[PDB]
Amino acid sequence: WALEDFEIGRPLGKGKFGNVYLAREKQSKFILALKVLFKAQLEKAGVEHQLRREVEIQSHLRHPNILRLYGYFHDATRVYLILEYAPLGTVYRELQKLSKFDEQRTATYITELANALSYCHSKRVIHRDIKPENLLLGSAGELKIADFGWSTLDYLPPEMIEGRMHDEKVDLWSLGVLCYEFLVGKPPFEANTYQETYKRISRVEFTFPDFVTEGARDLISRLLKHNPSQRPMLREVLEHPWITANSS
Numbered sequence: 001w002a003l004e005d006f007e008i009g010r011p012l013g014k015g016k017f018g019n020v021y022l023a024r025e026k027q028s029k030f031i032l033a034l035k036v037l038f039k040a041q042l043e044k045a046g047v048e049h050q051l052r053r054e055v056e057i058q059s060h061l062r063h064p065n066i067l068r069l070y071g072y073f074h075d076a077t078r079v080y081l082i083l084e085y086a087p088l089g090t091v092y093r094e095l096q097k098l099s100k101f102d103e104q105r106t107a108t109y110i111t112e113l114a115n116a117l118s119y120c121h122s123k124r125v126i127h128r129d130i131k132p133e134n135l136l137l138g139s140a141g142e143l144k145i146a147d148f149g150w151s152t153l154d155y156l157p158p159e160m161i162e163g164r165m166h167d168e169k170v171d172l173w174s175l176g177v178l179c180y181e182f183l184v185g186k187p188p189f190e191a192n193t194y195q196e197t198y199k200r201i202s203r204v205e206f207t208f209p210d211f212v213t214e215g216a217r218d219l220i221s222r223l224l225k226h227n228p229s230q231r232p233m234l235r236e237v238l239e240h241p242w243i244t245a246n247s248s
C-alpha cells in the first residue's frame with residue numbers, strides 16, 4: 001500500500017506523535033482512519049520499538065471493543081497506520097457535550113472496557129493509558145480502545161508516579177478514575193498544580209458528590225485502592241452488583 005492509494009479528508013485530531021485523518025480507499029470508497037507518525041519525531045522519543053509492539057499486537061489481538069489496525073506502510077519521512085474508523089468519535093468529546101453520563105451509560109462503558117481489558121490481560125498485554133482521549137465510539141455507540149503504547153498525571157496510578165513496580169492493576173486503577181469522571185464529569189484528583197495532583201493521587205484524596213449512588217461509590221472505591229493487590233479482578237468488576245444492576 002501507499003499514500004496515493006487513498007483520498008485524504010479532514011484531520012480528526014491529536015498532534016504530538018501523529019495526526020489521524022479521515023481516509024477513503026480509492027478502489028472501494030470504503031471509509032477508514034489513517035495515522036501519520038513522523039520517523040524523526042519517533043526516534044527522539046525512542047518509541048520506534050513501541051510502534052512495532054503495536055503492529056505485532058494487532059496481528060494477534062482482535063476484539064470488538066478494540067480498534068483494528070488493518071495494515072501499515074512508510075515513505076521517506078513518515079509511518080502510516082491504516083486504522084478502523086469509529087464514526088461517533090472520542091469519549092472525551094461526548095463528555096464535553098453531555099457534561100456527565102448517567103449510570104446506565106457509564107455501567108455499559110465500564111463493562112465493554114472490562115471485557116476488552118480482560119481479553120488484553122489474558123494474552124499478556126497491559127494497556128498503559130486508558131483515558132477519554134484514547135477511547136473511541138463505534139456506529140452503535142460502543143466503546144473502542146485506540147492505541148496501547150506509545151503512551152497529564154490524572155489517570156496514572158500511585159505506583160507509576162511514585163516510581164514503583166507496576167502490574168496489570170494500573171489498568172484497574174484507570175477504570176476507577178474513568179468511572180468517576182463519567183458519573184461526576186471531572187476526574188477525582190483534579191487540582192490547580194502538578195504538586196497537588198501528585199499529592200492527591202499519591203494519598204488518594206478524593207470525595208464524591210451527593211448524587212453518586214452507594215453501588216457506584218463502592219465499585220470506584222475498590223478500583224482506587226492505593227495497594228494494587230487490594231484492587232479487584234476484572235472478573236469481580238463484571239460481577240459487581242452495580243454493574244449487574246445496570247444491565248438488561
Ligand SMILES: CC(=O)N1CCN(C(=O)Cc2ccc(Nc3ncc(F)c(Nc4ccc(C(=O)Nc5ccccc5Cl)cc4)n3)cc2)CC1
Nearest residue numbers: 012013014020033083084085086087088089090092093133
Ligand atoms: C456528535 C458529532 O457530531 N461528532 C462526535 C464528536 N466528534 C468527534 O469526536 C471527532 C472525531 C470523529 C471520529 C473519530 N474517529 C477515530 N477513528 C480512528 C482513530 F484512530 C481515531 N483516533 C483518534 C483521533 C483523535 C483523537 C483525539 O483528538 N484525542 C484527543 C487528544 C487530545 C485532547 C483531546 C482529544 Cl479528544 C484520538 C484518537 N479516531 C475521532 C474524532 C465530531 C462528530
